[PDB]
From Swiss-Prot, chains A, B:
Homodimer, whose active site consists of two apposed aspartic acid residues. The lineage of its organism: Viruses, Riboviria, Pararnavirae, Artverviricota, Revtraviricetes. Residues 20-89 form the Peptidase A2 domain. Aspartyl protease that mediates proteolytic cleavages of Gag and Gag-Pol polyproteins during or shortly after the release of the virion from the plasma membrane. Cleavages take place as an ordered, step-wise cascade to yield mature proteins. This process is called maturation. Displays maximal activity during the budding process just prior to particle release from the cell. Also cleaves Nef and Vif, probably concomitantly with viral structural proteins on maturation of virus particles. Hydrolyzes host EIF4GI and PABP1 in order to shut off the capped cellular mRNA translation. This is Protease. Residues 1-5, 49-55, 88-99 are annotated as: Dimerization of protease. The active site is at D25. The chain holds residues 489 to 587 of 1435 of the full protein. The gene is gag-pol.
Amino acid sequence: PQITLWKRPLVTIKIGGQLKEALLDTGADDTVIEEMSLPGRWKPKMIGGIGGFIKVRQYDQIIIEICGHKAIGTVLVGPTPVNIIGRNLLTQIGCTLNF
Amino acid sequence: PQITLWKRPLVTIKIGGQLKEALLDTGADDTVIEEMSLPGRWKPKMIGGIGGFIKVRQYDQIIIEICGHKAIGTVLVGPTPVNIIGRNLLTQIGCTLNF
Ligand SMILES: CC(C)(C)[C@@H]1Cc2cc(F)ccc2S(=O)(=O)N(C[C@@H](O)[C@H](Cc2ccccc2)NC(=O)O[C@H]2CCOC2)C1
Ligand SMILES: [Cl-]
Ligand SMILES: [Cl-]
Ligand SMILES: [Cl-]
């Protein structure tokens, strides 16, 4: 698809069998999801945003469907205001910026 | 152009007669630039993201040249860690997400 930016680029994602709404975010290096349960071990990570840093849990090799495209990669879980699909997964679905 | 997302989508912009590096950010509703002087009136605003909120100065009807494309709109100025080109100006240059 071609997504214009007059509205937030929100899409449906599927993770852990649950449908959620997430933002396709070219300004985010990483993918960060609101609190949920994910399988396996997690590692600590600090991520910096507009107002400073938040502590998140890093889960690797997580299966996530984004707007119907399958991705498998790192998902961070923490106190984010919105579910964010960052560049680590936008590259897996073949996303580019065009003008 | 077509910009891939293996690295941060950083571009040169010209604003208030100055050249700066900025991130093309589909996840940002607004354009936020590091501290600089801009002409005209401003009003205070709070913008939120990962890590909480920052106070910024809102300048309206500001011209920015982004990759050689001229665009006019609201520019927020404040203590952002990175210069961000948000949707308000990405739409003006005809930027879309494609996959
Ligand atoms: C959350 C929300 C509400 C959608 C925020 C929306 C938002 C809306 C605005 F009008 C103005 C600013 C911002 S924001 O700028 O706050 N932001 C945009 C986001 O792309 C950000 C850019 C950025 C800011 C500072 C440093 C580096 C990059 N990346 C980010 O937090 O990456 C983190 C997130 C995961 O990867 C690293 C997220
Ligand atoms: Cl990844
Ligand atoms: Cl605007
Ligand atoms: Cl359009």
